[PDB]
Amino acid sequence: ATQSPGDSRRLSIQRAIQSLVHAAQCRNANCSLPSCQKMKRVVQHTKGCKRKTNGGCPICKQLIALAAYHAKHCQENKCPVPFCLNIKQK
């Protein structure tokens, strides 16, 4: 088997991240992948929000999760993602 908690869990976050990453990196608010919009807007929901984590709006949280636990593995300091190149400040 590949991943059994989730090839579907992983691949689904992998996509979450890839979307997220894309959404981070993609700066076209009218990319129309509105689902790209969305993720992007999710990054962007997240960051225009501060209740993201502080309150408990976990889009951002599961996005920080998403992004950071992503970050944790994308060694990059420069282009797309929320806590990605901000968690990635070493």
Binding site: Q14, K38, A65
Partner: peptide
């Protein structure tokens, strides 16, 4: 770039996945 990785890293994916692709038509 390493965008993909095991779900051991990441906590509950549940949200952003919907944001990645829910079905909005």
């Amino acid at each position: 770039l390493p965008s993909q990785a095991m779900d051991d890293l990441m906590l509950s994916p549940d949200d952003i996945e919907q944001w990645f692709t829910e079905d909005p038509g």
